[PDB]
Ligand binder design. Structure first.
Ligand SMILES: [Zn+2]
Length: 257
């Protein structure tokens, strides 16, 4: 029953998911002046050359592109991480207008959207077990600003008309997620949570400093999706972001000076 509306949105989630008021919730505001450069942090290793995308799905909260995670084909390592994390899916959060949509913020600045590339720690064997562990998941977060088009996003944009409503999916093979990355892998990192129910406190967040640019036409296509199922009153899938949560006793570390 949870969603992003007045009666089921983020301010309501704690009733079914009390960890919503926990000690390591996401997203957060990244205060750039307070984040500590950590020279012990390693470069991130993003190994997506053998990625195998499977499907694209409207799940009623976002759209997601799903990958074969049954072998080490597209993996995240290094950075703040110990061990190997397999790419399972990516999805986005976005706004009704360009001045909101991101989940993380940077010195209170909201971006138009935020891409989450979701990975799970192979030492737990499957994602269901990983979400029960404090180091179970690593989510790579990438901000989107509106300007020039992102060519590597266009294949995604062009199939969204086929998954307009909740429950629709389509074949989405041979998609290369490397086409969604910025030039720099400079990042901030902190321990946090899933940003949607069940809000499990299982995520090492890795948020890239450099946004990607997408065009107004690309983000407009996101905003034509629907939260509702076919047949139900049409409610545009916009503003599917959770606001910044209290940092509490956490330190955000920077990979860069
Ligand atoms: Zn997300």
């Amino acid at each position: 029953h949870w969603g992003y509306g007045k009666h089921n949105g983020p301010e309501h989630w704690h009733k079914d998911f009390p960890i919503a008021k926990g000690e390591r919730q996401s997203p957060v505001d990244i205060d750039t002046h307070t984040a500590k450069y950590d020279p012990s942090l390693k470069p991130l290793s993003v190994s997506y050359d053998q990625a195998t995308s499977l499907r694209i799905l409207n799940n009623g909260h976002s759209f997601q592109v799903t990958f074969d995670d049954s072998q080490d084909k597209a993996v995240l390592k290094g950075g703040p991480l110990d061990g190997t994390y397999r790419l399972l899916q990516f999805h986005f959060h976005w706004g009704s207008l360009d001045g909101q949509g991101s989940e993380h913020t940077v010195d209170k600045k909201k971006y138009a959207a935020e891409l989450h590339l979701v990975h799970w720690n192979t030492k737990y064997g499957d994602v269901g077990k990983a979400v029960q562990q404090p180091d179970g998941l690593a989510v790579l977060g990438i901000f989107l600003k509106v300007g020039s088009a992102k060519p590597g996003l266009q294949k995604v944009v062009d199939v969204l008309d086929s998954i307009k409503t909740e429950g629709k999916s389509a074949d989405f093979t041979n998609f290369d997620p490397r086409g969604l990355l910025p030039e720099s892998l400079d990042y901030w990192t902190y321990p946090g949570s899933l940003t949607t129910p069940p809000l499990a406190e299982c995520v090492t967040w890795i948020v890239l400093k450099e946004p990607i640019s997408v065009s107004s036409e690309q983000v407009l296509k996101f905003r034509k999706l629907n939260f509702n199922g076919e047949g139900e009153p049409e409610e545009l899938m916009v503003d599917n972001w959770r606001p910044a949560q209290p940092l509490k006793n956490r330190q955000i570390k920077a990979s860069f000076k």
